[PDB]
Design an enzyme around this catalytic site. Sequence first.
Site, PDB file in Angstrom:
ATOM      1  N   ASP A  84     -16.140  60.580  31.583  1.00 32.89           N
ATOM      2  CA  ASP A  84     -14.708  60.037  31.742  1.00 32.89           C
ATOM      3  C   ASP A  84     -14.023  61.036  32.008  1.00 32.89           C
ATOM      4  OD1 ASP A  84     -12.075  58.795  30.860  1.00 32.89           O
ATOM      5  OD2 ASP A  84     -13.656  56.874  30.939  1.00 32.89           O
ATOM      6  N   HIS A 108     -10.943  61.152  30.825  1.00 36.62           N
ATOM      7  CA  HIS A 108     -10.195  61.637  29.785  1.00 36.62           C
ATOM      8  C   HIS A 108     -10.852  62.095  28.729  1.00 36.62           C
ATOM      9  CE1 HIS A 108      -8.347  57.816  31.972  1.00 36.62           C
ATOM     10  NE2 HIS A 108      -7.015  58.549  31.522  1.00 36.62           N
ATOM     11  N   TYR A 125     -11.087  52.283  36.701  1.00 35.08           N
ATOM     12  CA  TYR A 125     -10.107  51.056  36.962  1.00 35.08           C
ATOM     13  C   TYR A 125     -10.090  50.567  38.384  1.00 35.08           C
ATOM     14  CZ  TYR A 125      -9.461  52.642  32.176  1.00 35.08           C
ATOM     15  OH  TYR A 125      -9.595  52.887  30.898  1.00 35.08           O
ATOM     16  N   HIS A 131     -12.084  57.000  22.623  1.00 40.15           N
ATOM     17  CA  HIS A 131     -10.922  57.278  21.735  1.00 40.15           C
ATOM     18  C   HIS A 131     -10.584  56.697  20.661  1.00 40.15           C
ATOM     19  CE1 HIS A 131      -9.701  58.833  25.574  1.00 40.15           C
ATOM     20  NE2 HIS A 131      -9.951  57.615  26.329  1.00 40.15           N
TER      21      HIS A 131
HETATM   22  C1  LIG Z   1      -5.527  55.098  27.742  1.00 37.68           C
HETATM   23  C2  LIG Z   1      -5.680  55.114  28.973  1.00 37.68           C
HETATM   24  C3  LIG Z   1      -7.160  55.249  29.606  1.00 37.68           C
HETATM   25  C4  LIG Z   1      -7.999  55.450  28.951  1.00 37.68           C
HETATM   26  C5  LIG Z   1      -9.160  55.710  29.728  1.00 37.68           C
HETATM   27  O1  LIG Z   1      -9.757  55.406  30.704  1.00 37.68           O
HETATM   28  N1  LIG Z   1     -10.246  56.154  28.536  1.00 37.68           N
HETATM   29  O2  LIG Z   1     -11.403  56.841  29.100  1.00 37.68           O
HETATM   30  C6  LIG Z   1      -4.523  55.237  30.067  1.00 37.68           C
HETATM   31  C7  LIG Z   1      -3.257  55.119  29.619  1.00 37.68           C
HETATM   32  C8  LIG Z   1      -2.450  56.409  29.919  1.00 37.68           C
HETATM   33  C9  LIG Z   1      -2.753  54.068  30.991  1.00 37.68           C
HETATM   34  O3  LIG Z   1      -3.058  53.942  31.975  1.00 37.68           O
HETATM   35  C10 LIG Z   1      -1.838  52.993  30.593  1.00 37.68           C
HETATM   36  C11 LIG Z   1      -1.478  51.875  31.244  1.00 37.68           C
HETATM   37  C12 LIG Z   1      -0.595  50.884  30.944  1.00 37.68           C
HETATM   38  C13 LIG Z   1       0.073  50.862  29.781  1.00 37.68           C
HETATM   39  N2  LIG Z   1       0.834  50.121  29.186  1.00 37.68           N
HETATM   40  C14 LIG Z   1       1.619  49.064  30.096  1.00 37.68           C
HETATM   41  C15 LIG Z   1       1.623  50.053  28.008  1.00 37.68           C
HETATM   42  C16 LIG Z   1      -0.297  51.874  28.724  1.00 37.68           C
HETATM   43  C17 LIG Z   1      -1.239  52.668  29.094  1.00 37.68           C
HETATM   44 NA    NA Z   2     -14.523  63.066  29.429  1.00 36.09          NA
HETATM   45 ZN   LIG Z   3     -10.924  57.195  30.870  1.00 35.15          ZN
END
Ligand SMILES: CC(/C=C/C(=O)NO)=C\[C@@H](C)C(=O)c1ccc(N(C)C)cc1
Ligand code: NA
Ligand SMILES: [Zn+2]
Length: 360
Positions: free
Chosen positions: A172, A174, A305, A135
């Site tokens: 991935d 995303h 995760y 990203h």
């Molecule tokens: C960016 C991402 C995964 C990326 C990935 O896997 N890239 O491939 C997930 C975001 C939606 C997320 O889950 C999140 C969780 C907590 C949070 N705060 C507690 C502020 C802010 C964002």
């Molecule tokens: Na992807």
């Molecule tokens: Zn991801």
Amino acid sequence: KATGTGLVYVDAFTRFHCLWDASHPECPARVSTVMEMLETEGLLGRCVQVEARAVTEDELLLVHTKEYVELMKSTQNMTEEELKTLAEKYDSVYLHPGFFSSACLSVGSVLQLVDKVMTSQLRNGFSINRPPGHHAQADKMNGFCMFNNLAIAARYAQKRHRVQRVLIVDWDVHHGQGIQYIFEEDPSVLYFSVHRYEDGSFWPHLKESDSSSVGSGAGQGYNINLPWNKVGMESGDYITAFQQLLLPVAYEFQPQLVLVAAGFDAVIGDPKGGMQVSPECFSILTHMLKGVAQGRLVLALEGGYNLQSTAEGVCASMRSLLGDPCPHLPSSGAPCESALKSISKTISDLYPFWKSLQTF
Ligand SMILES: CC(/C=C/C(=O)NO)=C\[C@@H](C)C(=O)c1ccc(N(C)C)cc1
Ligand code: NA
Ligand SMILES: [Zn+2]
Ligand SMILES: [Cl-]
Ligand SMILES: [Cl-]
Ligand SMILES: [Cl-]
Ligand SMILES: [Cl-]
Ligand SMILES: [Cl-]
Ligand code: NA
């Protein structure tokens, strides 16, 4: 011929974490759990250990601006409040005094494997790295990423190893919009991402994550997005996507190196991805990619995760890199109607650019 599978891991990958949430999903345990399972499964000892190195400024500047690199470097000395203030200017980012150092080793770990693979010292390799990269953008952090590991590695392979064509495969869950932006106008890099989308309702919520974004300029046709619009996709959906869309294009493109944004947030059990892909599926996807680029394949960890699920996905991919027989897929089955709809729509958007897709 090249033999051996490289693995990069350093303790620095565990030396940064979220300062305001002890339960943040992007955490050191992601990579330590992977390493523990690689050892328990007997896979770690079968790999060639490859040293990490810190990326240089010149290497970062293949992708990132000088101003952004300087700002990221300055985070080493910021206070916890200064770090929080800056991180909140970005989308889904936390910062830490060790983030920059770890990010530099995260990039450099991929460059090390590219060196070994392109000079035939190893057949393939896998970096067990954090922070992730797909990203990150020329001048901003995004989505837990500071520097775009694979985008830098692709341009590094072109400059240092004279590679003409690089394929980047992003499995991935995303969309790696950072990689898309970097190579938007570039026909020497073909970017393919499969990702949950749900008509934009799934993060990062971008219209350009849809399959209508095919690249521009000389790069037209070299960006391929496969968006899923329903949750619960399984191994049969991913296998169909690879066989009907990605691999036909890949064999026509004839890359000299394949880089994989190897996230495992599409695996069964991931708390964010919402998909139901068995970890064993990633042995099959890895196997398919070995058929192009003479097996020159480098995987780098992105998301994922659920600590067990991500570790299982890495292990399954590693078994393929090592040459072990492909697994039997348990919950195997034909692709679902929703997956076929998405695959059909992406094929229709990329049809004009790839003769291999014109089977009707
Ligand atoms: C960016 C991402 C995964 C990326 C990935 O896997 N890239 O491939 C997930 C975001 C939606 C997320 O889950 C999140 C969780 C907590 C949070 N705060 C507690 C502020 C802010 C964002
Ligand atoms: Na992807
Ligand atoms: Zn991801
Ligand atoms: Cl923060
Ligand atoms: Cl070397
Ligand atoms: Cl191979
Ligand atoms: Cl399965
Ligand atoms: Cl169905
Ligand atoms: Na491109």
